[PDB]
Ligand binder design. Structure first.
Ligand SMILES: [K+]
Ligand SMILES: [K+]
Ligand SMILES: [Mg+2]
Ligand SMILES: [Mg+2]
Length: 135
RNA sequence: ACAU
DNA sequence: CGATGT
């Protein structure tokens, strides 16, 4: 079981959980940063991981790329498979923004198709995912 | 327990 | 140490 180097890797970074959430996607082989989401004032780690995968799906579809996506998040990979983010985060004014983004990401999954493999990054064998924030 |  | 998740 070896790394698929021709892939996109995503990760979340946060200040608090729940807290400020950002995410980015990188070329697994080179580390080149391909997209970075503006920090969201309040969210959860798993909402960020979910949004990062869905943004990766949208990024690769727009560019007609068949590359797989690596995520280290068991939770987010399942949420994407399910097309349903089962977050416990309260819905209030402070969490409105991230919940809007999560709702819209689910909506995108329910109205689009993709063949993109979404693969578990095996941190125990390979070290930190290439998109890691190092926090 | 596993993944963050 | 605490929080998010299956
Ligand atoms: K980190
Ligand atoms: K736990
Ligand atoms: Mg991660
Ligand atoms: Mg990380």
């Amino acid at each position: 079981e070896e790394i698929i180097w021709e892939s996109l890797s995503v990760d979340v970074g946060s200040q608090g959980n729940p807290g400020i959430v950002e995410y980015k996607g990188v070329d697994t082989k080179t580390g080149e940063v391909l997209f970075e989401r503006e920090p969201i004032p309040i969210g959860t780690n798993n909402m960020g991981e979910f949004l990062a995968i869905v943004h990766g799906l949208r990024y690769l579809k727009e560019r007609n790329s068949r590359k797989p996506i690596y995520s280290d998040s068991q939770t987010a990979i399942k949420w994407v498979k399910d097309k349903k983010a089962k977050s416990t985060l309260v819905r209030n004014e402070e969490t409105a923004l991230i919940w809007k983004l999560v709702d819209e990401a689910e909506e995108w999954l329910n109205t689009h198709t993709y063949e993109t493999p979404i693969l578990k990054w095996q941190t125990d064998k390979w070290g930190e995912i290439k998109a890691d924030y190092g926090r």
